[PDB]
C-alpha cells in the first residue's frame, strides 16, 4: 500500500474489518451529520452489457461517525504494473 | 499567562451541528485581498485567551 499517500499528516481515525468482495456488486455511500453509511449487497449477474430488470435489496453493512465536508470522490485501481 | 488554549475567530460561514475545522489560514476581513500577505482587511483567526 503505497499508491499516492505521500504526506500522511497526523490524523485521527482508523478501522478494519473483514473483505468485501459476473459479479454485480452494488453499493450505497450516504453522509448525514457527520455520519458515513455504507450499504451493500452482491449478486451474481448473467446479463451482457448492463443493468438487469428485477428488483432486490440492499443491507446495512457499516456506520462511521466521522465528520468530513465531502464533496468529491473517486475510484482506486490496480493495473499490471510489470 | 497560558497562551495555548487558543480558538479560531473569524470564518467565512456557520458550521452545521458536530464537526471540526483545522483550516489555518488568513481570513478576509473586508474588501482587501489577502493573498497569504496579511494586512489590512486581513486576520489569523486563531487567537490565544
Ligand atoms: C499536527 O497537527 C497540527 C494541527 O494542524 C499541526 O499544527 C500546525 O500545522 C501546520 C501545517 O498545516 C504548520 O504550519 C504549523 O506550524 C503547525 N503548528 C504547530 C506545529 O504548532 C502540526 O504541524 C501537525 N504535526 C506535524 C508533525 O505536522
Ligand atoms: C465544504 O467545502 C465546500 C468547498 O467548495 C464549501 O463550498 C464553499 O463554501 C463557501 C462558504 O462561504 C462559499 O463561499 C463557496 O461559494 C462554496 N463553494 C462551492 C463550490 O460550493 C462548503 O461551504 C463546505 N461546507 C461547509 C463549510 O459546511
Known sequence: ESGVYSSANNCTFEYVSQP???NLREFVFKNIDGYFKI??????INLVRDLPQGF???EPLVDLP?????TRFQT????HRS | G???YRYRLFRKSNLKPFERD??????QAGSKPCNGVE???????????
Open chain 1, 20 to 22: 468485501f468482495l459476473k
Open chain 1, 39 to 44: 450499504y451493500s449487497k452482491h449478486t451474481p
Open chain 1, 56 to 58: 432486490s435489496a440492499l
Open chain 1, 66 to 70: 466521522i465528520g468530513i465536508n465531502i
Open chain 1, 76 to 79: 482506486l485501481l490496480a493495473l
Open chain 2, 2 to 4: 497560558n497562551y495555548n
Open chain 2, 22 to 27: 483545522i483550516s489555518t489560514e488568513i481570513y
Open chain 2, 39 to 49: 494586512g489590512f482587511n486581513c486576520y489569523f483567526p486563531l487567537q490565544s485567551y
